[PDB]
Structure formats: structure tokens, C-alpha cells
Design an enzyme around this catalytic site. Structure first.
Site, PDB file in Angstrom:
ATOM      1  N   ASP A 174       0.867  -1.193   0.000  1.00 56.32           N
ATOM      2  CA  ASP A 174       0.000   0.000   0.000  1.00 56.32           C
ATOM      3  C   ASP A 174       0.903   1.243   0.000  1.00 56.32           C
ATOM      4  OD1 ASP A 174      -2.949   1.032   0.468  1.00 56.32           O
ATOM      5  OD2 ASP A 174      -1.760   2.186   1.901  1.00 56.32           O
TER       6      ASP A 174
ATOM      7  N   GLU B 139       1.243   5.280   0.219  1.00 56.35           N
ATOM      8  CA  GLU B 139       0.725   6.635   0.443  1.00 56.35           C
ATOM      9  C   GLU B 139       1.752   7.608  -0.158  1.00 56.35           C
ATOM     10  OE1 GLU B 139      -2.329   7.142   1.814  1.00 56.35           O
ATOM     11  OE2 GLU B 139      -2.538   4.976   2.159  1.00 56.35           O
TER      12      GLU B 139
ATOM     13  N   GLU C 148      -3.161  17.524   1.223  1.00 57.83           N
ATOM     14  CA  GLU C 148      -4.017  16.328   1.467  1.00 57.83           C
ATOM     15  C   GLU C 148      -3.241  15.171   2.113  1.00 57.83           C
ATOM     16  OE1 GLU C 148      -5.079  12.973  -0.952  1.00 57.83           O
ATOM     17  OE2 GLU C 148      -7.119  13.736  -1.210  1.00 57.83           O
TER      18      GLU C 148
ATOM     19  N   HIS D 125       2.591   5.393  10.636  1.00 58.18           N
ATOM     20  CA  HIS D 125       1.748   6.189   9.752  1.00 58.18           C
ATOM     21  C   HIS D 125       2.331   6.062   8.361  1.00 58.18           C
ATOM     22  CE1 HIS D 125      -0.269   7.628  13.268  1.00 58.18           C
ATOM     23  NE2 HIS D 125      -1.001   8.489  12.585  1.00 58.18           N
TER      24      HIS D 125
ATOM     25  N   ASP E 234      -0.476   0.338   6.652  1.00 57.10           N
ATOM     26  CA  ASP E 234      -1.586  -0.106   5.847  1.00 57.10           C
ATOM     27  C   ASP E 234      -1.292  -1.494   5.322  1.00 57.10           C
ATOM     28  OD1 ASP E 234      -3.233   2.238   6.121  1.00 57.10           O
ATOM     29  OD2 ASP E 234      -2.043   3.263   4.613  1.00 57.10           O
TER      30      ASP E 234
END
EC number: 2.7.7.7
Lengths: 279, 218, 145, 366, 218, 366
Positions: E6, E8, E55, E156, E161
Site C-alpha cells: 500500500d 501513500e 491532502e 503512519h 496499511d
């Protein structure tokens, strides 16, 4: 829309009344208008007919208690009674609204005990501003909107701003000057506000109301400043703004957004106020 | 299957949650007759998300196959028709879940083209308004013994009427509630019934954007 | 019908002339006047007794009265079902035959062809068409859903 | 912390203390037990803010102090499931509790003792001792008359009145009443306290009906009950209980007896054909004859004739039959005496030969 | 052999190419063999070549200045390629990550083909959507559904994830398996009678006279 | 119309007949019984329209033919309620049923017998009699594995298949499967029928295990059980039960044996710390040792190590502990033998002494 028109034309216009009210909006001789009962959101159809029926069999209801005894709790539920007070249905009789809200239950108990004395129960062992002036104006009018839809006596700041304004809202916006999105001047009369979130962030919040008496909306996707513009937006008895408007694609709500803000003092800048006295 | 509906319905059947699909359908323009070809010309984000999103492509390709397609009978009927003999001499019936509210299986245009005369249902509540206002006027009779009032018997040059109209106070005046229409009334200051007949014909994109309105007024 | 209880079968009903058309119009009206459930309006088989002349009947194939009874393999039930159409619809009742690669079609077909010769009854084939092109199947699936 | 105990010493306490605990309460730590080893003693404390149960069990082998807290339900099921005579060695290490027995080995997540709400120690005000079996009688004879969800929050519970040489219990929901009065044989202080529905359920639960004296301490707003080294304490609510002397029928002149079990079997049967909502029945009584009738919407009817001892005027009165069936079942007697005043007033119901238990239901008019 | 990732990133583009003008910041993947973690985690941070988007910053927090000295995709191109090449690529919203990956691959100009040509990319969201139709099938949604906390965990970003998704993935694709199991021959041909043929002729006459064609008679 | 029977002739019939009723009977007359008096025989029917119970008792006292329909539950309770040894007199007067016992009288509304739906008489195809005991073991041993609500509605029931002198049942979810086979001692024709779960529940309940043999008839669309003078009739569900012979493991190569009680005790205790919903526990087997491990989402951990007879290869396998406890509870035997294959296959399980019962469950791979 209709009310705004009514108001400008004249007065009375009145809160609902259990004693006087008909099925729909009715005109007493002097009273241009009195509320129709079906107007109320929460009250059922059965209760509206019940109220009128009880008014028919009895005369005008003498007091809160007298109303509750004539129409049993079965027909007119406590929940129902609460909305009637909030509408201002009782105001004449129970000048103290707060008093009337509290007095319902005890008055109901006696009436039921009369009914019980009569029939099918199990029986039992034993055993047992506020003044002539009602609930305050600001607060009372606030409640009425929630229950009926609108402010009575016109908005908490209803009475003019016109020369800047047009007071028409969505109905005006349909047929507008062409552009990407309508350019518009809005003054907010009244707003109750926070800056909220979602545990992720979230786009909001402007709460815009458009007066004179026209219409207000949630909106809905904005933002600009981050917290500074948000708090200027905030909160009682102040605002005029410049904001860009589009007519929403979806029906039942539009975009009226605060792109710009000006203060009462900043609104008083509005162009530059001049003094007019009529002598 | 109208534009908004077909997108909503195809999207749910393609297994998206309501949020995903509504993010797309809210970009489809409002218009009553909306089609995919019209949607692509009105909204440039549509071409763009089609090429950028495989799910949107699959969805629109399927919405293209089902565009315009009939879904179900309808909350309301279309009208009332009068046969010279039993209706079954011409069509079968459709009825509701209790076998009530019988309706012709052929629609508006088709049922009449198959030879029976029809009469439209009309939802507008302006005559309900007049009705209620007449009740309320005629109550004012016994209050001062005045004859009941006949809206058909009014004079055709009434000054009160034209005074209020020249004051542009025509919201809730039937069909003429538009701000644009009130803009026109303001400038024109219309003073006779002929002008009233004209208003709805003038208040359109063609007449306004051909200068005939201005010629007429001048 | 009372024979198969609640289970619904498929039927194709043609009006062959205007006598039939009026009988069909009456039959449709009668079904809607009776009321129905989520499955939509249904006919009683025996409505076809009185509501009869000018109509020619197709059995429904594997999904019909006789197809379903054939697939059960209840020979007595099959015989009783056809018997009704042999009485009330001589030369006017057809077996639907379908090869579209779906569950039980060939097994039913083989048994229905045997029944059809054994009873002197006629068959007609259809393609039970729902779409223009083979790539429209997916869209029809979605339409139904 | 470390101790090792015999399954059988631990098991009944575990059962008594766990049994009222909802598997999943609204405030997590309430489902865990406070465990304290200090001196040669394990103290168990589990609560729901309304009540608390404390158990002690003798630690005869080496032990080590500390504090811990494990899920109550799960621990009880684990201990119930253990083999007969099991010697279990458990040891707290950091914030994992390791549970051993033989070749079984376990590892449980842990919430701290420090988070557990330590409620207040208080001074006893009224004290007395009694056989466990008398307490259980007192409670059984009475507890079924509490309300469920009535606005008069003090009826979900029991009035205690201790006066002179007597201890008395009475319970009610406003619609039926039960009184029980029993000698306690000691001069007590005068104090009244209303303990909750859930308190009475649990007190009854722990009444292992035998010999052991039960000693109870009531405070002004708290109650604690010791039988031996099992210790129950609940919070109280104070408020205004009703006066049983205003409910008591004045001087019931008319007396009516019948054999209790035959009376009860007959009422159980007439109940089946009663109005579903109220379970309402009508009694017509005349010289040496009793006629009970009922009716329902289904248009069924009941009539009973039996021989009862009745001398007195005829009388017409309706009750909810469930309410009288409740008393007839609790009363384990041969013959009963009913004392009426009239149709609109209390009726007292009692064993003709005992008076230890007394029940009054107010009647209906149908 | 099964490969979990995953990623980010430095925020995303909302429209069009979500990867255009944007770059990868962290690669955090766990390797899964026989539905177990060996513990051979590949957790690396790379060169942003640009600013982290507001974001992405709010998603799990991360400073741009931290990823400045860290190497570019070119320095771990072969390293990461061999780590995943010819294995199972299970991704959440595969269009997102794959889009970025192949984007960066093309930027290297190293003849390296798109990962989807030598690795089987399978979306877990598609599977979840099949199993739970019209339900929120986001990572955090499934997390809360199976009572897994991914919010009060120190990790984080990617590695967080990845770990969580692995557990969820295995749970869903374990869950409890199931047993379950799941032409010639004579025949009459009713030929139309002469009377029916007369009706046929008359009916074709109607078709032809009214329409100007009849293919049966052509 | 009249008959008189004694309460004690009616009690066991009435109990039995009242079992199948609770259906939320939408068609209200399903809550009623069909009474037919003809000859000196009162016939009762108690039914949910898919299954039916008929009983005959001989009438020694005076009777008169005719028929009625009274509400079943209420009628059952009244009769069960009447005192021991009581002679109860029933009599239909036109549209009302009178119930008398000595001096008490009851008048109930009545629905006419003539309205009561009749499910058709049918013909039998396969027939056998057997001791109650054998039928008891057979049902008990398998019923727990039935689906409740499945799309494959035919699996909401049990496959009955006859072959040689074996009747052989199976019931399943699609996840777990139990099979049971017993010697029947009679030549049986081969048949296949699926009886609905509700049917098997009721059949289970009618077995007292006593001396009356059970005699069964099976037709095309219904199945009927005669024990002495009571008769149960149900309809069958259409068919197509998947072939259990296909799913069977083909020579499971590992043999794993353990004391049933010990093993079951350990599973019950380990289950407390599994995931509440899915109950997934993981197993490590090694040379003559069994190591059980369980994890749940809240990080709680159980472990059991045990001495297990096992010859075979090392392998790991995880599964739903509730389903395996269900089989251990159905296995009324000393020690169990487990036959395994690998970490990804179902396993076959038997009583270490009897081939009579066979259980196979699918694994979860965690």
C-alpha cells in the site's frame, strides 16, 4: 416567498390558535390571516382533527388544562402538545410558555385519572423574560422557524437593507445575467454557526440565510481562508458579503457562498453610506 | 430512463456504493430531455473522467445501451379517454396492486392514434386557489349582505389591476412570477389586456434575442 | 394451476384473429382485476376454458406446465396437463423447443420430443430473443436486475 | 503477583460474583475484576456501580502481592471449564497475566487496577444477624411485586423497616403488594433504606439456604452484607416509599377459605381463556359456593364451580389473574384465607394458619 | 508467492491523471508466503522531486524535508523490480498505485515495461465489492468492520496499511472453506390449411398495399 | 356430538400433537385442531399444513359423531391443567364447544371442522419398522448440521437414502457434514427423499425411546410415521441433494486418537478466547503431542498442549471451534479417532469403536 409578499402588503398574520384555527389558513374579520393547522410539520392528521373536533363539542378552550381534559391524551399526545407550544398555538392562554410546557404532564394525569375512574384500568393502591411577557422574542421566534418554517414578526433583523439588495434568492437566480456563475450581494440577517470537521477534514461550513424574508440554505461545497474567514463569517446579528452564486444542478438547495466578507462596519463602508433624514 | 435515473440505477447494479455514483450523476446537467450526447457537450468533465476512469467508462457504455428505455407503469396516469363502447373493445387494462385504477396499456399518443378521444389530467392548483378565494370572498357576503362575486363578470380595463401590475407585484400571479418577466413589466408598464395576452409569448429566448420585444415597447 | 401449486410457468399467447384478440383482451383484464404479488399478475390455466376461441397456445418449453412436469419426471402429471389442451385446443397447442445452452434444456427437449410423438402434438422452435447482438447480453442482465 | 489455588475454593465465589455481569457493559472496566493480593489474602472486587461483591479465599502456599484486572466473564468460563481438583498456578508479569494448569497455558490482555472505580468505605448504622434461610424467605415472599420500568424509581426495590424487635420486608409496584414480617431477636437502631431490583436478585442468588448467619451493615446511602467471608455491598437510593398502613384493608369483616392447590390449578386453567392483555377474571361468590368466570375477544368463556368455605354476602370483583397466580404459587400451603373489605378496596391474602407471608392485590372494575 | 503493498504518496490529482506532475515518497510492502509474514519487509523512502501535498500531509503526516536526502526511484528501480517481479500484486484501488508506478517507470527511460505485463495485479476492492455490495469498502471501513485499529498505531503511512491489509486480506480469503458440491424421431408438422392460406394471402395484400413491400412475395 | 375420555388417556397424545404448533399461523385455523368423531373414535389433527399429526384413542364412555375445530395451544393447556384422575366431558353444541369437568363448565368459540383443509391421502413406496432407540440415535447424531436458511432450500432438511439393509442420513451446511448409518435388519428398497428440518425436529420430539416400535411409510410427496396409535405425516421437499460420496476424503493418511471428554473440555475452554463471531483456532500437531493455539482480534491468547495418540506427518490446520464442539457433543463415546489429510483438506472423524457415525468438516485457512 408568499409570506414575504404578504408581509410587505400588510399585517396579521398571527401564530396558530387552537381556539380560533380552522383546517387551513383562515381570515378572521380583522386578522388578515391565521395559521392553517396542516402547516405544522410534526402534528399528525388525527390530532389536527381531534383539536378541531374538541373545539366543536366544547366552546373555546378556557385553559391548557381545559384543553387536555376535553381532548384525551389518547388523541392529543404529549409529543403533539409539545410541538403545539413550540408553534405558539397556546400563547394566548398560557402567557408563560415555559410554564405551559411543564404544566402539560400534571394536567394530563388528572384527565387520565378521570378516564380511569370511568373504565378499563387496573385500579391503584394509593397514593401520590417570564412574566405576563412570554418567552423571549429572539428565542421564541427561533423555535417557531424550526417548527413552522419561518420567523414571526419578520427576521431577528427584518426591516430593510434594500438598496444593496434584491431579496429574491433562487427564484431570481433562475433568470439571471449571463456569466460562469452569478455575481451576487448577500446579507445574511441571522446565522448560527460553528467550524466543524469529520475526523478526516471536511469542506464546510457556511450557513447563509438570505433576507429580507426570502430563503436560507446549507452550503455546501466551499472554503476560503482556513479559520480566519470562517470566524469572520461567525455569528450573531452581523453580516453583508460579496459571494459568487451558481444555481445548483440538484434541486432543493442552491449555492450561495461567502467568497468575500464585510463587517457591519465593513458593510457600513458599503460603497459609503450616506445619511438620509426624512423631515 | 432519464439521465439522472439511468446513471443511478446502472451504478447500483454495477455494485458501487451510493456515494461513488452520486459523485458522477451530480455532474449530469439538469435539463428535462437529457441524453448522453447532450451531456458530453454541456459538461467537459464527462469526456475527461470517461477516459480517466474505467468504472465510469463501463457505466456510460452501459447507460448508452439503455438510454430512453421504459422502466415501469407510473405513479400517475396520462389522461382520461372516452370510448363509444367498452374499453376492452380497443385495449386491455393495466391496474394497480389491488386491481384498481384501470389504465389503457397504450400511452397518450398511441391510444389516441388507435382511435379513442382523450382528455388530459391536469395537476395545477390555480383553480383550487380561485375556488378557495371565491369561498373566502363570498363569506364576506353575509358580513355585509353583498352579492356573491363572479370572477367572469369583472370589467376588462380595471385600474386597481393595472395599478398593481405597473407596480410589478406579480409574483404569485400565475405564470408571470419570473424575475425576468418582472424586469420586463417594470420597463414596459403594461396598461391593457392585449399586453397581458402578449406577455408569455414575448417572455421567451427568441423574442428577447430578436429585438421584437424592444420594438413593440418602443 | 392447482396441479403445481404456487410454481409459475411461462406461456406465449397469440391472438390469431379478432375473436382471439377480444378473448385475450378479456383475459388480460381479468388477471389484473384479480390482483397479484411481487411476481406480477398471473392467470389460472382454466380461464382458457371459457376464454378460448380464436387463440392458439404455446406450451412455454422447459419453463411451461408440461416442461416443468417433464423435468420432475411425473408422467401422470404430464399426461393430465397435456390432456387439457388436447380437449380444449386440438391442433392449437404447441410445444416450445429451445437450445440456448441453459440448465436442463437438452434433457427436457429429448423427453418433450418423445411426449410430442406419443401424443400426436405439434412443436415450434424459437430463439427466445432478448437482444440485438451477443455483447448486449450483459446489458440485458443489468436491465433485468 | 503470584498465588496458586484449588479450583473448588475459587469456583463458587467466581460464580456468585460473575453471574450478574453482562458480558459487554457500556463502560469497559466494569466487566473486569480488581484482583488484590496483600498479606495472605486474595480480595476480589467486581461492580456495576449499583452493587459490588467481594470474596476472600485462604492462600495456604507462597504468594506475592500486586494488582491486576482480567475480563470477568471469560475468566469465569475458563475456571468453570477446568478439570475437577485442578491446581492452577497463575503469575502476573508486567501487563500480561499467565494462567497455568498442568499443560494448559494462557495469556490474557489486561486493563490496570488503577482504572477501577474505588467506591467509598462508610460507617455502619444499623446492624443485625440472621440465618441465611430466613433472609431467603424474606426476599422470596416479596421480591416478585417490584415494578420493571415505572416512573416511581423507588419501587424497583424494597422498603426496609426495622422497628422494636421486628424486621419487616414489603415490596410493591403500585398495583400489587407483598408484606413479610419475621422476628430477628435483637434490639435494632431505626433506619429505612431502599435497595434496588438488581441488588435483591443478587442477594437472593447468594443465599446458599443453610445455617450461616448473615450480618448486614446499612449506612445512610450505602449497604453492605457479610455472610462469612463473602461480602456483598450495593449503593442505595434513598427516596419516599409508600406507607403500607394506608394500603392495608381496614378491618376485613368477611373471610373466605378454600384448599390452596385446587384453587391454584383452577386459576391456572381459567387463565387460558382470559383477555390476552389484562388476564382479567371475575369472581362471584355466594354461600358455600364460588363462581369464577372470564372472557376474551376470541369469544371464549370460562366458568368455574368449586366448593369453598365462604359465609358472607355475595361480592363482585375483577382481578388480573397473573397477579393472584403469582401469590398462589409462592404460597406453598394447604388452605389459604382471603380477607376482603369490598370491591373497591384492598383484599388481604394469607395462609389461614401462619401470617408469616401476606399479599394484597388491589382489584379491577371490568 | 504473494506480495502485499500500500503506497501513500505526495497527494493526488482529483481529475485526469492522478500521477501527472506527482511523485512517490514511500514504498512500504510486506512479503507473504503461505499466508504468513516471514518478516522480510521492504520499507523504503524515496525522492519527492516536488512538494508533499496538503491532502497527503493530513492523511498520516510526513515532512518534505525528511524525503530530500533519500534516493530517487532510479536508485531502487532494479531493487524493487526484482522484489515484486513474477508475483501476486494485491492492491487497494489498483488504478491509483499502478498508475503512479508505471508513471515513474516510464520516467526512468530504462526499457522497463509496465509492472502489469510481468505481474498479476489484483484489486481487493473488487472482491470486497462483490462480497459486500453497496457497503463502504475502504481500508478504514473494513478495518472497523473486522474490529482492527489502524488509527492508534504508531506506523503512519505505507508499512501500517500493508500490515493491516495483509491481515484483513487473509481473513476474508480464509474465513472458512466449503464442501459444497455445486434429434431425429418421427413428428407431425401442422401445415396451414387452404382457409388459413386464404387469410394469409389477404393479410399479405394488406401489408403490401399499405407498405409498398412484402419480402414473403419478393 | 359428544364423547367422554379420561384426562390420562389424552395427556401423552395432547403433548405430542401440540409440539408442531408455533408457526406464527397466518391462516388462523392452523392454530386450531381438527376433531372428528365417527365410530367410537375421536381423531385429532394438529398441523402446520406441511406436516400433520393424527392420533386415535378408543372411546369407552358415551359418544356421538360430529366434528369441530378449537384453538390448539389453549385447548392443550386447559387439559394438561385439569387435575390428576379427572374425568373431563366434552360436547359440541352446534357452533360452540362445551368443556365440562364435574361442576365446572367452559364455553369456547369454535371453527367448523368442515372448513379445515385436508392434505391428501397418498400411497406408500418404502416401508420399514424399527425400535425407537435406533431412530433416536440416527436423528440425534446428525440433526445439528442442518442449514437453517439456505438458498439451496433442499439442504434445510435431511437426505434419506436406502441401500441394501442400510438407511443412511446426512445433514449439512455446505461447511460441516455429519453422516450416520445403523443396521436395520430388513431388506429395504432404494429410495431418496428430503424431509424438512421442521419435520425432523418434530420427529425427534415424538421419540420417547420406549418399547413401541416405529413404522414408517414414504410416498412420492409425503412421509408418515406410525408408532402404535399415533401418526405423523409431513410433506417432502423436492430433491437434488449433492453427492456426499464425492466430498469424502480418499484414504486420509494420518490417524489421531484422543479421549473424547478431555478433548471436548479443552475445546470448550479454548473457545472462550477465540473470535466471538468466527471461532477460528489453530492446531499444531507433532510426534505424539497436540498443541492447540487460539488468537482473537483483542490480542487475547489461549494455549492447550495435550497427550494425543497420533501416528503420521506433521501438519497445521485451523477451523471453527463451535462446529467441532457440536460434533464432540453428538459423539457420545469414550475416545475419538480423527483421520486427517493436510492443512487444506476436510478431515474425517469417527468414534474409535464404531463406524456408525462419520463427521467431516471443512477447514478455514487463517
Amino acid at each position: 416567498g408568499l409570506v414575504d409578499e404578504c408581509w410587505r402588503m400588510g399585517l396579521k398574520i398571527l401564530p396558530p390558535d387552537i381556539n380560533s384555527g380552522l383546517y387551513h389558513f383562515h381570515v378572521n374579520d380583522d386578522g388578515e390571516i391565521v395559521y392553517g393547522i396542516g402547516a405544522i410539520k410534526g402534528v399528525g392528521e388525527g390530532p389536527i382533527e381531534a383539536i378541531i373536533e374538541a373545539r366543536n363539542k366544547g366552546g373555546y378552550f378556557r385553559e391548557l388544562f381545559d384543553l387536555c381534559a376535553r381532548t384525551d391524551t389518547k388523541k392529543l399526545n404529549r409529543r403533539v402538545l409539545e410541538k403545539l407550544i413550540m408553534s405558539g398555538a397556546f400563547d394566548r392562554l398560557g402567557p408563560h410558555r415555559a410554564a405551559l410546557m411543564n404544566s402539560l404532564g400534571d394536567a394530563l394525569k388528572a384527565a387520565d385519572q378521570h378516564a380511569k375512574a370511568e373504565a378499563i384500568g387496573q385500579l391503584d393502591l394509593f397514593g401520590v423574560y417570564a412574566s405576563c411577557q412570554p418567552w423571549p422574542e429572539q428565542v421564541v421566534l427561533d423555535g417557531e422557524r424550526e417548527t413552522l418554517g419561518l420567523y414571526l414578526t419578520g427576521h431577528p433583523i427584518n426591516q430593510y437593507l434594500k438598496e444593496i439588495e434584491r431579496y429574491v434568492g433562487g427564484v431570481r437566480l433562475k433568470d439571471m445575467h449571463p456569466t460562469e456563475r452569478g455575481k451576487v450581494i448577500t446579507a445574511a440577517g441571522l446565522v448560527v454557526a460553528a467550524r466543524v470537521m469529520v475526523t478526516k477534514r471536511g469542506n464546510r461550513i457556511g450557513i447563509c440565510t438570505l433576507d429580507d424574508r426570502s430563503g436560507r440554505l446549507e452550503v455546501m461545497l466551499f472554503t476560503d481562508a482556513l479559520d480566519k474567514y470562517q470566524q469572520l463569517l461567525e455569528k450573531d446579528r452581523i453580516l453583508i458579503v460579496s459571494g459568487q452564486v451558481s444555481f445548483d444542478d440538484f434541486s432543493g438547495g442552491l449555492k450561495m457562498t461567502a467568497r468575500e466578507v464585510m463587517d457591519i462596519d465593513e458593510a457600513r463602508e458599503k460603497y459609503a453610506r450616506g445619511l438620509a433624514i426624512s423631515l | 430512463m432519464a439521465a439522472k435515473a439511468v446513471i443511478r440505477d446502472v451504478g447500483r447494479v454495477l455494485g458501487h456504493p451510493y456515494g461513488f455514483v452520486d459523485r458522477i450523476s451530480k455532474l449530469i446537467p439538469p435539463d428535462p430531455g437529457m441524453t448522453l450526447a447532450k451531456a458530453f457537450e454541456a459538461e467537459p468533465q464527462l469526456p475527461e473522467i470517461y477516459e480517466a476512469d474505467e468504472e465510469v467508462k463501463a457505466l456510460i457504455d452501459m447507460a448508452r445501451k439503455l438510454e430512453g428505455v421504459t422502466r415501469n407503469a407510473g405513479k400517475h396516469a396520462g389522461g382520461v379517454v372516452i370510448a363509444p363502447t367498452k374499453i376492452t373493445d380497443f385495449a386491455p387494462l393495466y391496474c394497480d396492486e389491488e386491481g384498481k385504477h384501470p389504465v389503457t396499456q397504450f400511452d397518450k399518443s398511441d391510444v389516441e392514434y388507435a382511435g379513442l378521444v382523450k382528455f388530459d389530467f391536469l395537476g395545477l392548483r390555480t383553480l383550487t386557489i380561485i375556488n378557495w378565494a371565491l369561498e373566502m370572498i363570498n363569506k364576506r357576503r353575509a358580513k355585509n349582505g353583498e352579492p356573491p362575486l363572479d370572477i367572469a363578470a369583472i370589467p376588462l380595463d380595471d385600474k386597481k389591476s393595472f395599478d398593481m401590475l405597473q407596480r410589478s407585484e406579480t409574483t404569485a400571479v400565475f405564470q408571470l412570477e419570473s424575475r425576468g418577466m418582472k424586469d420586463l413589466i417594470k420597463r414596459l408598464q403594461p396598461d391593457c389586456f392585449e399586453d397581458m395576452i402578449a406577455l408569455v409569448a414575448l417572455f421567451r429566448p427568441g423574442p428577447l434575442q430578436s429585438g421584437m420585444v424592444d420594438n413593440f415597447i418602443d | 394451476c392447482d396441479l403445481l401449486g404456487d410454481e409459475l410457468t411461462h406461456l406465449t399467447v397469440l391472438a390469431a384473429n379478432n375473436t382471439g384478440y377480444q378473448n385475450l383482451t378479456l383475459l388480460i383484464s381479468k388477471a389484473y382485476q384479480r390482483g397479484y404479488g411481487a411476481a406480477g399478475p398471473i392467470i389460472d390455466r382454466d380461464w382458457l376454458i371459457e376464454l378460448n376461441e380464436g387463440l392458439i397456445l404455446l406450451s412455454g418449453g422447459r419453463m411451461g406446465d408440461v416442461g416443468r412436469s417433464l423435468l420432475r419426471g411425473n408422467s401422470a402429471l404430464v399426461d393430465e396437463c397435456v390432456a387439457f389442451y388436447e380437449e380444449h385446443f386440438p391442433d392449437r397447442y404447441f410445444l416450445e423447443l429451445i437450445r440456448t445452452g441453459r440448465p436442463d434444456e437438452e434433457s427436457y427437449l429429448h423427453a418433450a420430443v418423445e411426449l410430442a410423438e406419443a401424443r400426436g402434438l405439434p412443436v415450434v422452435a424459437t430463439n427466445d430473443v432478448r437482444f440485438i447482438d451477443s455483447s448486449d447480453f450483459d446489458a440485458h442482465e443489468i436491465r433485468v436486475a | 503477583m503470584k498465588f496458586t489455588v484449588e479450583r473448588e475454593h475459587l469456583l463458587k465465589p467466581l460464580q456468585q460474583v460473575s453471574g450478574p455481569l453482562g458480558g459487554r457493559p457500556t463502560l469497559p472496566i466494569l466487566g473486569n475484576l480488581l484482583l488484590q493480593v496483600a498479606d495472605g489474602t486474595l480480595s476480589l472486587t467486581g461492580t456495576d456501580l449499583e452493587m459490588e461483591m467481594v470474596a476472600r479465599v485462604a492462600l495456604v502456599q507462597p504468594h506475592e502481592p500486586g494488582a491486576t484486572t482480567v475480563p470477568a466473564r471469560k475468566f469465569f468460563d475458563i475456571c468453570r471449564g477446568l478439570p475437577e481438583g485442578a491446581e492452577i498456578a497463575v503469575q502476573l508479569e508486567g501487563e500480561r497475566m499467565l494462567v497455568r494448569s498442568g499443560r494448559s497455558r494462557f495469556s490474557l490482555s489486561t486493563l490496570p487496577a488503577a482504572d477501577f472505580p474505588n467506591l467509598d468505605d462508610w460507617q455502619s448504622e444499623v446492624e443485625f444477624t440472621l440465618p441465611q434461610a430466613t433472609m431467603k424467605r424474606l426476599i422470596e415472599a416479596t421480591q416478585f411485586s417490584m415494578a420493571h420500568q415505572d416512573v416511581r424509581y423507588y419501587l424497583n426495590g424494597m422498603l426496609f423497616e426495622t422497628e422494636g424487635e421486628e424486621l419487616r420486608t414489603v415490596a410493591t409496584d403500585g398495583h400489587r403488594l407483598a408484606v413479610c414480617s419475621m422476628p430477628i431477636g435483637q434490639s435494632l437502631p431505626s433506619h429505612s433504606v431502599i435497595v434496588p431490583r438488581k441488588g435483591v436478585i443478587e442477594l437472593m442468588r447468594m443465599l446458599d439456604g443453610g445455617d450461616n448467619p448473615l450480618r448486614v451493615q446499612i449506612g445512610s446511602n450505602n449497604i453492605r452484607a457479610h455472610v462469612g467471608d463473602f461480602i456483598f455491598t450495593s449503593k442505595l437510593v434513598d427516596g419516599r416509599f409508600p406507607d403500607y398502613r394506608r394500603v392495608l384493608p381496614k378491618n376485613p369483616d368477611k373471610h373466605l377459605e378454600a384448599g390452596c392447590d385446587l384453587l391454584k390449578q383452577a386459576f391456572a386453567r381459567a387463565a387460558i381463556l382470559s383477555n390476552e392483555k389484562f388476564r382479567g377474571v371475575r369472581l362471584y361468590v355466594s354461600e358455600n359456593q364460588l363462581k369464577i368466570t372470564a372472557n376474551n375477544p376470541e369469544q371464549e368463556e370460562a366458568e368455574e364451580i368449586l366448593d369453598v368455605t365462604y359465609s358472607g354476602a355475595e361480592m363482585e370483583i375483577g382481578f388480573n389473574v397473573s397477579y393472584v397466580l403469582d401469590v398462589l404459587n409462592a404460597l406453598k400451603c394447604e388452605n389459604v384465607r382471603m380477607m376482603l373489605t369490598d370491591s373497591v378496596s384492598s383484599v388481604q391474602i394469607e395462609d389461614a394458619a401462619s401470617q408469616s407471608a401476606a399479599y394484597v392485590v388491589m382489584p379491577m372494575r371490568l | 508467492r504473494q506480495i502485499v503493498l500500500d503506497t501513500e504518496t505526495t497527494g493526488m490529482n482529483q481529475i485526469g491523471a492522478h500521477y501527472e506532475g506527482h511523485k512517490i515518497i514511500e514504498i512500504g510492502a510486506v512479503e507473504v508466503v503461505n499466508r504468513r509474514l516471514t518478516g522480510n519487509n521492504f520499507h523504503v523512502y524515496l525522492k519527492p522531486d516536488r512538494l508533499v501535498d496538503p491532502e497527503a500531509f493530513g492523511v498520516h503526516g510526513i515532512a518534505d524535508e525528511f524525503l530530500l536526502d533519500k534516493p530517487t526511484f532510479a536508485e531502487v528501480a532494479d531493487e524493487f523490480m526484482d522484489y515484486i517481479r513474477g508475483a501476486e500484486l494485491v492492491i487497494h484501488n489498483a488504478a491509483f498505485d499502478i498508475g503512479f508506478m508505471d508513471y515513474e517507470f516510464s520516467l526512468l527511460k530504462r526499457d522497463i515495461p509496465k509492472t502489469n505485463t510481468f505481474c498479476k495485479v489484483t484489486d481487493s476492492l473488487a472482491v470486497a465489492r462483490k462480497m459486500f455490495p453497496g457497503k463502504r469498502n475502504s481500508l478504514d471501513a473494513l478495518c472497523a468492520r473486522y474490529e482492527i485499529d489502524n488509527s492508534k498505531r504508531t506506523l503512519h503511512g505505507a508499512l501500517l496499511d500493508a500490515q493491516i491489509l495483509a491481515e484483513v486480506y487473509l481473513a476474508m480469503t480464509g474465513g472458512q472453506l466449503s464442501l459444497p458440491l455445486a434429434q431425429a424421431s418421427k413428428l407431425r408438422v401442422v401445415f396451414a390449411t387452404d382457409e388459413e392460406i386464404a387469410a394469409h394471402e389477404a393479410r399479405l395484400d394488406l401489408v403490401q398495399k399499405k407498405g409498398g413491400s412484402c419480402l414473403w412475395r419478393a
